[PDB]
Amino acid sequence: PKDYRVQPHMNVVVPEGARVEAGDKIVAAIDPEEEVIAEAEGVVHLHEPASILVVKARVYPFEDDVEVSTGDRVAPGDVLADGGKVKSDVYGRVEVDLVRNVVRVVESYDIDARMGAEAIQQLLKELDLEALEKELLEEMKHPSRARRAKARKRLEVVRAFLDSGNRPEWM
Amino acid sequence: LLDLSATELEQVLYFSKYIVLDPKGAILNGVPVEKRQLLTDEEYRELRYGKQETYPLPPGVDALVKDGEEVVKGQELAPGVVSRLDGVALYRFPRRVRVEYV
């Protein structure tokens, strides 16, 4: 095992635990010449990374076929790679890494979310006075005293907004 | 009317920047999407980058994790860095390549 000190100003197109024999360049420096070539046979390892960064992405390796491109929110099930054997489990940007031969997706979502009063106003608009009336109309009777006092004061409010002509968005 | 906590939840998101969880969402922090519940100014922002934190390493300080590899919240990523969130580990740039060569 010969380490060979690779300076940071040199590119390296080798994934961790790769396969290399005496003909395939490992540290392929940005600059040509003197750059290390394949020293003998075997696998390859990478030591002392300047930064070890964790990400809430998930790892989905592949051997061939890269259909899903970079930056698309992929839903839990949508085929990522490998024709169809590789599928995501969560939404978020898919960062393909041909270097390490693996496509990963950063678990993120397009959650709508506001602050202050414009946050509440729109939510007040969305509130359907109709359905809630029946929902509570049942929530008042079937449940016990625990939910009873809740729906009790709760229903009268909406009921008051209905027989009024003034939507609760006006608040 | 809006089934929020009568006083607390109100004040919390009413004046502050404390994100309200109105429509949409499905991704979680342990329990599925909150329909009307609230989440902190940190929860929201940090949802787009869970664990996504760069942990710089000094030279001559190898690692304890080989590239792509699942980490635990608090697990020593390196012998000089202690990660503060779960997920997978990833490298950055190479300085050493030690491996069997016939």
Side-chain angles (χ1 to χ4, degrees):
Chain A
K2 272 183 172 178
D3 290 38
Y4 185 93
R5 168 68 179 111
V6 33
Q7 295 295 111
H9 43 268
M10 299 197 150
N11 291 332
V12 179
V13 195
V14 179
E16 166 61 64
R19 292 289 295 181
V20 174
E21 302 81 1
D24 293 80
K25 61 173 186 177
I26 37 165
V27 174
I30 332 180
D31 48 287
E33 182 55 43
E34 188 272 351
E35 54 178 356
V36 73
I37 331 176
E39 303 173 334
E41 56 81 76
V43 288
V44 183
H45 296 291
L46 295 170
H47 294 300
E48 47 174 11
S51 245
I52 303 184
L53 64 96
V54 297
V55 183
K56 202 189 279 175
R58 319 193 76 93
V59 276
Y60 307 95
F62 77 95
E63 292 196 341
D64 34 73
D65 174 275
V66 188
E67 26 220 14
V68 157
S69 302
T70 304
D72 168 43
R73 255 81 47 221
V74 285
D78 288 74
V79 186
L80 296 181
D82 264 319
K85 201 203 65 179
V86 169
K87 299 163 171 290
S88 177
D89 291 49
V90 273
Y91 309 86
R93 296 197 316 262
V94 260
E95 293 184 8
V96 308
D97 195 13
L98 306 181
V99 181
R100 296 180 174 93
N101 284 321
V102 53
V103 295
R104 71 182 82 97
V105 43
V106 290
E107 183 172 359
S108 71
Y109 216 8
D110 186 19
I111 287 192
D112 272 349
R114 291 182 182 85
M115 62 208 71
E118 68 165 351
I120 289 189
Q121 175 179 0
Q122 199 246 25
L123 185 57
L124 272 176
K125 298 187 180 182
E126 283 296 356
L127 187 127
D128 189 38
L129 311 155
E130 293 181 333
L132 182 62
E133 174 157 0
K134 305 174 291 185
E135 174 181 340
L136 302 177
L137 195 150
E138 315 316 310
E139 183 67 4
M140 181 58 197
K141 307 173 187 176
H142 312 58
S144 303
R145 180 54 40 82
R147 307 166 261 172
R148 161 164 294 146
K150 168 78 180 304
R152 177 58 174 179
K153 48 167 272 57
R154 183 178 171 86
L155 177 57
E156 174 59 28
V157 175
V158 178
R159 181 63 178 177
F161 287 97
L162 181 58
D163 306 74
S164 304
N166 44 268
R167 301 293 174 266
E169 51 182 343
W170 299 6
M171 284 200 253
Chain B
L1 185 155
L2 269 186
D3 198 37
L4 294 168
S5 302
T7 56
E8 181 128 331
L9 261 55
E10 214 104 84
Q11 167 72 50
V12 160
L13 47 72
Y14 179 73
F15 289 102
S16 165
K17 196 189 305 180
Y18 287 141
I19 293 304
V20 71
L21 196 52
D22 68 342
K24 283 203 190 62
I27 300 298
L28 38 61
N29 62 314
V31 51
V33 59
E34 309 167 287
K35 337 90 193 180
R36 258 195 253 194
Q37 253 71 26
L38 86 176
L39 54 85
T40 172
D41 182 25
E42 334 306 321
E43 183 89 12
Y44 181 61
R45 215 163 48 77
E46 297 166 345
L47 184 138
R48 305 185 173 282
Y49 57 83
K51 307 140 177 42
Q52 224 281 65
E53 176 178 358
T54 302
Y55 298 92
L57 265 190
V61 186
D62 218 277
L64 263 315
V65 173
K66 289 199 184 310
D67 220 316
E69 195 258 303
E70 295 289 350
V71 209
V72 201
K73 190 192 78 63
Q75 161 74 296
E76 282 202 41
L77 269 179
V81 171
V82 181
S83 190
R84 285 182 285 97
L85 252 169
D86 291 289
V88 311
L90 173 68
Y91 276 178
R92 215 49 177 88
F93 296 112
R95 294 152 139 167
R96 202 139 298 176
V97 186
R98 177 182 179 268
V99 50
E100 312 281 277
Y101 290 146
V102 153

